[model samples]
Target: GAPTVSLPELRSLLASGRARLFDVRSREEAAAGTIPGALNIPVSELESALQMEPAAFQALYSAEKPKLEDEHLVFFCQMGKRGLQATQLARSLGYTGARNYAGAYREWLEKES
Candidate 1:
């Protein structure tokens, strides 16, 4: 399981430049708009995607390069369920810094704007 973070804390983490946001919503839903710098990797695709090595990941997930270590990976979804699941999956795969935004994207959009 992963720890949950509040929106403000999440924003601060993001601004620090050490954190990356993974949006776990469908492509169609994400096309509507997302947190300014979020990388859209639907929940269904997370497992295989996270398995890629950093160099391979950079080639595929170009919006943001991925690192399995020393990175704060924040996952979010429309609400929270999928984000929570994605966080857990990342942790299971050994991403020690992976976390979930409890309020997810809905809260982010409401509070950020």
Candidate 2:
């Protein structure tokens, strides 16, 4: 199993600016709302996106490309499934620090509400 990030840990990480949060949901879904500081990178495009050159990635995503060594790279989706899949995908691509926020956006919404 891949590494997991719990809700409280995620909150702390976000507050401290230590987490790079990736929301692996569709663009439309993400446009509605997301966890603070999360970047919307649809799961379908994540593989190639991760492989892109830093400049290309930045141009497309309008954010800094995540580094392989970044220790707090966190991925999440509406539910835990896609988030886990994204984390595994990233790890397979040699992103050693990739992690799944297993409680995901559903948990976040509940906690924040």
Candidate 3:
């Protein structure tokens, strides 16, 4: 069981630093478009790399340096499908607080003031 946040809640969460946004999309996609302050890690690499690269996993999750899973982890992809998948993976890996921003990164870019 983990906490989930909605797209409508993202602005407040981000403003309050209550969570971190992870954007799972390609560099080309990012260059074409992106949301503010989103961390770029393509979903393709994330699934395999996080499983295989132990240190990288810890490093990637490490916030405030050397600490893991410090922030409420909200993942986002194009239409939220990939992010939903990744959120499941995160839960499988024992991330008790993993969440999917269901409206997706694209929606975030389009909406939100």
Compared with the true structure, all predictions reach lDDT values of 0.82, 0.91, 0.69
- Model 1 residue 101 distance off true place after TM-score fit, in angstroms: 0.6
Off by over 4 Å in 3: 1-3, 52-69
Residue-pair clashes per prediction, in order, are 0, 0, 0
Stretches > 4 Å off in candidate 1: 63-65
Residue-level lDDT of model 1, residues 40-110, one tens digit each, is 89999899888867677677778545666746788899899999999999889888888998798778778
Top model number, TM-score: 2
Off by over 4 Å in 2: none
TM-score of 2: 0.95
Sort all candidates by lDDT, best to worst. 2, 1, 3
Q: Which is the winner by lDDT between candidate 2 and candidate 3? A: 2
Between prediction 1 and prediction 3, which has the larger lDDT? 1
- lDDT tens per residue, model 3, 1-113: 24557766778778898877777777688667776777766777666644655676657645222114555777788888878887778677766667888888667767856
Q: Of 1 and 2, which scores higher on TM-score?
A: 2
